[PDB]
């Protein structure tokens, strides 16, 4: 018996994730493990008969799916357009400019975001040695620098993204939680946010203000891309192959330009060593830069305001996308998926 | 903006203020009449509450007035508690034949309305 949960990027706004019980029979066992994404074909049947008719009010049952076949992929029409795009000279600059178009400036951050989205090669050299393939990014700066809304673009762009807040997270919740099976009464383990974000990206906002233990829980995940646990006799390690994007504020809430980085933050050199790219932001004042930023922001707020009709509205939306980005965003998402694949 | 650039009126500005003054009371009276009509029209959408699910007689006016508010009226057009009390008091005057509530010692106790009909008596407005 295996539980299938809604994909992290597919949860509807403001609702808890839905899930169903899936029954694997006839040698269809061990086809999947926690963290894997699968598609299954089966029969929608009811089998929860018993005391439920009297324990809860009125006679009711519960539904399960008995699995028949399961599977853990691109047409030529998509690859042709991808290869058409790939031959453009200087494609890197278009891709970098494509990240979060409504955010003005911060190109040195946008490049890091794009690089983390594409990622590298997890070179398992000779098997006996391994290297993490994903880039870790820390966004440190003063308030009013969009260190948070960038994560609200990675969450909407990457194939599988998980977002968490520093004080709204727990060490058990992020890594893994222990459960007792309702049928076999045995100790069982359920993956946390890092296990869910496997082969994806994990987002942690306000990374500085979380308690020290929840911050410590991220140590193994940032380099081993795995979760090691020993609770209630359960000893196992899960895959947590995800990149981490963290946003934080400096000590006192404003960056002291006259002091080093190793003094402006409550973090420590170990934690900083697990990152690759550190983006330091100053909210310094200047008439020209401020005028540029304000005239960009006011037009962004003009655009985002409301105002075969489906086709016409899609055309108008893509027109607005062209007004601000060189690449259509659906094509960018597909391109990122294809490149990672 | 600066639209009032050259309204070069004569001493008739005093007569303009007379126009402002001497008819303001008429507008206030019209606003009061409009509130009266507001109540006299909302009572048409209230008596269904009384008709539907109240046949006993333990209901004091304090209960029914608090039941007109925090009710179907809690909607695109909310209503106030004192407005609900005014509605419930005006129902007796507008329908003498079915409501004869009397002061007990403090406040009013409302009994089971006879309810000959529902809305045909609104013609008196």
């Amino acid at each position: 018996r295996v539980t299938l949960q809604e994909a992290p990027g597919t949860v509807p706004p403001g609702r808890l994730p839905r899930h169903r019980e899936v029954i694997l029979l006839a040698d269809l066992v061990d086809v999947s493990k926690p963290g894997e994404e699968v598609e299954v074909t089966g029969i929608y049947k009811n089998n929860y008969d018993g005391n439920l008719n009297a324990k809860n009010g009125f006679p009711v049952f519960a539904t399960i799916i008995e699995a028949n076949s399961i599977k853990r992929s691109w047409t030529e029409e998509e690859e042709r357009e991808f290869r058409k795009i790939s031959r453009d000279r200087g494609i890197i600059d278009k891709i970098i400019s494509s990240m979060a178009p409504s955010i003005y400036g911060h190109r040195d951050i946008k490049t890091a975001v794009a690089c983390s989205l594409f990622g590298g090669v997890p070179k398992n050299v000779n098997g006996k040695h391994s290297i993490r393939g994903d880039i870790n990014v820390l966004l440190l700066g003063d308030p009013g620098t969009a260190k948070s809304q960038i994560l609200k673009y990675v969450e909407k762009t990457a194939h599988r993204a998980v977002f968490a807040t520093g004080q709204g997270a727990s060490a058990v919740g992020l890594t893994a939680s222990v459960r007792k099976d309702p049928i076999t009464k045995e100790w069982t383990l359920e993956g946390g946010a890092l296990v869910l974000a496997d082969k994806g990206v994990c987002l942690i906002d306000e990374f500085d203000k979380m308690n020290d233990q929840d911050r410590t829980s991220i140590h193994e995940a940032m380099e081993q891309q795995s979760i090691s646990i020993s609770k209630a006799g359960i000893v196992t390690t899960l895959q947590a192959r995800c990149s981490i994007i963290a946003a934080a504020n400096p000590n006192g809430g404003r960056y002291n330009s006259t002091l080093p980085l190793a003094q402006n933050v409550s973090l420590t050199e170990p934690i900083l060593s697990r990152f690759d790219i550190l983006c330091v932001v100053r909210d310094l004042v200047d008439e020209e830069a401020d005028e540029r930023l304000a005239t960009f922001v006011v037009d962004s707020h003009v655009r985002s305001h409301p105002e075969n009709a489906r086709q016409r509205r899609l055309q108008r939306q893509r027109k607005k996308e062209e007004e601000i980005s060189p690449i259509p965003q659906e094509l960018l998402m597909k391109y990122i998926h294809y490149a990672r694949t | 903006m600066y639209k009032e650039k050259m309204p070069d009126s004569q001493a008739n500005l005093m007569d303009r203020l007379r126009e402002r003054e001497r008819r303001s009371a008429a507008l206030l009276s019209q606003r009061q009449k409009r509130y009266q009509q507001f109540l006299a029209m909302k009572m048409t959408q209230v008596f269904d509450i009384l008709f539907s699910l109240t046949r006993g007689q333990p209901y004091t006016e304090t209960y029914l007035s608090s039941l007109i508010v925090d009710s179907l009226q809690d909607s695109n057009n909310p209503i106030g508690t004192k407005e609900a009390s005014e509605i419930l008091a005006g129902l007796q005057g507008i329908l003498p034949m079915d409501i004869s509530v009397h002061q007990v010692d403090g406040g009013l106790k409302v009994y089971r309305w006879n309810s000959l009909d529902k809305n045909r008596f609104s013609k008196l407005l």
Binding site: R303, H305 | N77
Partner: protein, 528 residues
Amino acid sequence: VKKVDDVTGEKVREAFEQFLEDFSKVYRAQIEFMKIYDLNTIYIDYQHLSMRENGALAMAISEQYYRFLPFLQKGLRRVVRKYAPELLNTSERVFQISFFNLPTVHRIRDIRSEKIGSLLSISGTVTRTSEVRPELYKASFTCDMCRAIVDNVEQSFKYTEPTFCPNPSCENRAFWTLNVTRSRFLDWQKVRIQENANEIPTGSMPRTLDVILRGDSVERAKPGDRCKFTGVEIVVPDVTQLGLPGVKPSSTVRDLTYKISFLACHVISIGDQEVFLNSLSSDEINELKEMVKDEHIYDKLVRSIAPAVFGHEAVKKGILLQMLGGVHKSTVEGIKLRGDINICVVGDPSTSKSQFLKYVVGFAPRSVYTSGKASSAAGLTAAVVRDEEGGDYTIEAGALMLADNGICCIDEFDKMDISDQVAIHEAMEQQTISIAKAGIHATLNARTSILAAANPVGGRYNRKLSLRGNLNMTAPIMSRFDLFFVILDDCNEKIDTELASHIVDLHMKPFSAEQLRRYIKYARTFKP
């Protein structure tokens, strides 16, 4: 052998069929719409039901609804066979009726045993919900001795086996085989709601109740929503009555305990110029229009917030603007722009800063009042608590999730511990609450406007120093308040004389407070 007939029920069914045939035939158009779109449930406006026979039909149906429902169901299915027999086809006559638009709405406070078996409407804030399940509406059984079949075995609130084998040539009883293919099922859901804040007087605790939903109406209830239900009250067996004092009746031995639950058929959540305007009458439109089409309305509304507090006009403007928060925007990139406005006020221990909070919580359609030291991190955002009916966790609404799309008031803000001030930040800027604790990984709506009150670091305003040294709040939290006021006290005689006069008149005793809610309900929809 002829069974006993309900002649009143037959008359009711005939009247209901005549109502269906004569009402104008919009409901027959609804039936055709259901046939076109493959719909299971028909919906009936109660005020349409109450406009035939002076509404006596509706009264009779409502006051004994649990009895008369089968007759109306029979009438409707006869009508559908008369006009749309294809809806009886499967791949077998499942059909539901849902009434809405009740005139009266009843509180959890006013639940009585007299209301049992009658149609009524209630409203309450949802706190916990269970997952949807299938319910055995009508079952069928096959005999065990012989192989006869028994259809249409309605399972009234309990698992019910057939009492006899229909063929007299068989003596089967107390043993049956349940069919799971010819039998038909329906959706099931339970909603656990709470009494609203404006119902309970101060010093009184809110009541809780469990509400039952079935059919397609399920999943339309979300936590934190001021939902509204329509249906009938039904009692269900209870096991917690044991140990109570007083004589308990017995059946002969068997137990006969009960507890009260509400079954609702229609679900709606309370909440674009023309849509709103078409729901108001001419006089209502005129009354709302006077408050909009006048030259000085802005100053008039400024001079109307909290009329008991003298002076302090800046905060009166601020609260008025906060109550009409900005339009929320979503970028073509999908990034969302926050629209709600936060306000912080700091004053000396003498200036009336708490009365603004009390006026807001007493006036706002949705509002929650709390104290800085009394509040905690879990009590503001959301609480991770073990759920009933299972071993998994489930959220509970904190101070921020409650009064969503409303104003949240916090007093003694500077007294709050920083570790539980931090959690308010995400709601203050992202309008969301993110949870990654104990099997919950969802992100919740936190569209709330934060209103706070605080005191300087030394209680008194140390007027020797500047604004920088008199506040313990750091830059990150100060940056998130769209408006920020520091009000002071001075020994000016002309001010203190009037202040004394009015604060003494208080102890001696343009637009009314009721009108402001009506105005805001119209104003809030605009998108400049």
